[PDB]
Amino acid sequence: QSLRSSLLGLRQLLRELPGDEAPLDALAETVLALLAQYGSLRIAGLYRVRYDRTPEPQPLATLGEMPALDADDLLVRTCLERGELVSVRQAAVCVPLVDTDGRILALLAVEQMPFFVFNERTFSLLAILAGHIADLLQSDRRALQLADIDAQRFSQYLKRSLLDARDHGLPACLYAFELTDARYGEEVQRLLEGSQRGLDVQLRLRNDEGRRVLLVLLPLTSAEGSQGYLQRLRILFAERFGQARELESLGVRIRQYELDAGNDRQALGHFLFNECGLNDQQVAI
Ligand SMILES: Nc1nc2c(ncn2[C@@H]2O[C@@H]3COP(=O)(O)O[C@H]4[C@@H](O)[C@H](n5cnc6c(=O)[nH]c(N)nc65)O[C@@H]4COP(=O)(O)O[C@H]3[C@H]2O)c(=O)[nH]1
Known part of the structure; x- marks a missing residue:
C-alpha cells in the first residue's frame, strides 16, 4: 500500500539520521511533504507543540504562501485541547501529530486545500498519517526504557x-x-x-x-x-x-x-x- 511504503520511507530516513539531531527538526520538510501529498494541500505549515499543548509560532516547514500563526486562533486552540483533527467545515484544518501515549508532538496547520478534498475521507487520511508519523519520531526515547x-x-x-x-x-x-x-x-x-x-x-x-x-x-x-x-x-x-x-x-x-x-x-x-x-x-x- 502507498501508506505503508510512505511510512517505510520516513522510517528509513529516521534510521539513516546522523543520530545527534532532533528528528522533528531534521525531517520537518519530509513530514510536511507527506502530509501535503495525502491531503492535496496547497498552503500549510508544520509547527512544534510544547509539553503543555501550546504551539511554537516559528514554523518548522511551510508549503505555499504560508501566513504566520497568530496568538490564539480558535482552530489551533480547539485542535490542541482535543488532541484531534479539527476543521472549519459545515484556517481550514488543524491536524495534531499525536503519539500512542497521547503526546502532541507537532501541529499541521492548513490554510488552503482544494474544496473537493475538504471532506471526511481526506481528514481521515491526514489523521491516520499524522498518528503514524508521531510514533516514528519517538524512537529517540527507547534509550531510557528497560524493555528490549x-x-x-x-x-x-x-x-x-x-x-x-x-x-x-x-x-x-x-x-x-x-x-x-x-x-x-x-x-x-x-x-x-x-x-x-x-x-x-x-x-x-x-x-x-x-x-x-x-x-x-x-x-x-x-x-x-x-x-x-x-x-x-x-x-x-x-x-x-x-x-x-x-x-x-x-x-x-x-x-x-x-x-x-x-x-x-x-x-x-x-x-x-x-x-x-x-x-x-x-x-x-
Ligand atoms: N522482495 C520484496 N518484495 C516485495 C516487498 N513488498 C512487496 N513485494 C513484492 O510485491 C508483491 C505484492 O506485495 P504487497 O502489495 O505487499 O502484497 C502482498 C501482501 O499483501 C501479502 N504479504 C506477503 N508477505 C507479507 C508480509 O511479510 N507482511 C505483510 N504484512 N503482508 C505480506 O501478500 C501479498 C503478496 O506477496 P508476495 O507474493 O510476496 O508478492 C509481493 C512481492 O513480490 C518486500 O519488502 N520485499
Whole structure:
C-alpha cells in the first residue's frame, strides 16, 4: 500500500539520521511533504507543540504562501485541547501529530486545500498519517526504557494498530506461531525471523508451557494480505525444510487474530494470555 511504503520511507530516513539531531527538526520538510501529498494541500505549515499543548509560532516547514500563526486562533486552540483533527467545515484544518501515549508532538496547520478534498475521507487520511508519523519520531526515547528495543517497538506498533482499527476501521493481523516440537523449534523460529518484511514486527517469547512462540504483527494489512503472508511463508518453509514437510508437521501451531472494531474488548487478552499462554509481563500496550 502507498501508506505503508510512505511510512517505510520516513522510517528509513529516521534510521539513516546522523543520530545527534532532533528528528522533528531534521525531517520537518519530509513530514510536511507527506502530509501535503495525502491531503492535496496547497498552503500549510508544520509547527512544534510544547509539553503543555501550546504551539511554537516559528514554523518548522511551510508549503505555499504560508501566513504566520497568530496568538490564539480558535482552530489551533480547539485542535490542541482535543488532541484531534479539527476543521472549519459545515484556517481550514488543524491536524495534531499525536503519539500512542497521547503526546502532541507537532501541529499541521492548513490554510488552503482544494474544496473537493475538504471532506471526511481526506481528514481521515491526514489523521491516520499524522498518528503514524508521531510514533516514528519517538524512537529517540527507547534509550531510557528497560524493555528490549524489539519489545518496545512491538508494543508501540500493536497499540497504533489497535487505534487504527478502533478509530479508522483499518485492518491488521496478529499471528502467533507456537512451536511445539523442540527438535525443529530453533530453526523454524530463525526462518520466521528472517521472513520479516516492511512494517511487520515480531516478538520472540516462551509461553507458560515452555514453548517458543513467535508473535508477528502485520500493520495496515487487509485479510487478503494476511492470507498472502501465510502463502509466502509456506513457500519459504518448503524451500527451507522438506517439500514433504508442512509448517504443521514441524510442530508449528498457527493462531491468528484479526484486529477489528467489532471484536469484543476482552478478545485480544483471551488470544494472547489464554490461547497463546502468554502474560502481561511479555506483551502489553
Ligand atoms: N504484512 C505483510 N503482508 C505480506 C507479507 N508477505 C506477503 N504479504 C501479502 O501478500 C501479498 C503478496 O506477496 P508476495 O507474493 O510476496 O508478492 C509481493 C512481492 O513480490 C513484492 N513485494 C512487496 N513488498 C516487498 C518486500 O519488502 N520485499 C520484496 N522482495 N518484495 C516485495 O510485491 C508483491 C505484492 O506485495 P504487497 O502489495 O505487499 O502484497 C502482498 C501482501 O499483501 C508480509 O511479510 N507482511
